[PDB]
Design a protein. Structure first.
Length: 95
């Protein structure tokens, strides 16, 4: 039941997205986060990876992403968590 969830808040058009990961077993895991924004007058894309030790039974905040989303803006946040063995978790925001 190890999973990735997204905690989100909104102020007008400012969005704060905090990807969360809760694991049944403790791991040395590779965490990949791909964020993309395609606005009317600008585009932005962030690829970030981090290999660190994660504890079990606790929700871990992976990153804090602040995005300015307006009508018709293409936004995508893909988070991938893998231990290198049998665990591979991939979730996308918006759900």
């Amino acid at each position: 039941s190890s999973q990735i969830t997204f905690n989100t808040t909104q102020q007008g058009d400012m969005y704060t997205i905090i990807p969360e990961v809760t694991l049944t077993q403790s791991x040395l895991x590779r965490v990949q986060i791909l964020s993309l924004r395609e606005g009317s007058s600008g585009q932005s894309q962030t690829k970030q990876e981090k290999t660190l030790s994660l504890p079990a039974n606790q929700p871990i905040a992976l990153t804090k992403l602040s995005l300015n989303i307006s009508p018709d803006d293409r936004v995508k946040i893909v988070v991938t968590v893998s231990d290198g063995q049998s665990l591979h978790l991939s979730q996308q925001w918006p759900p």
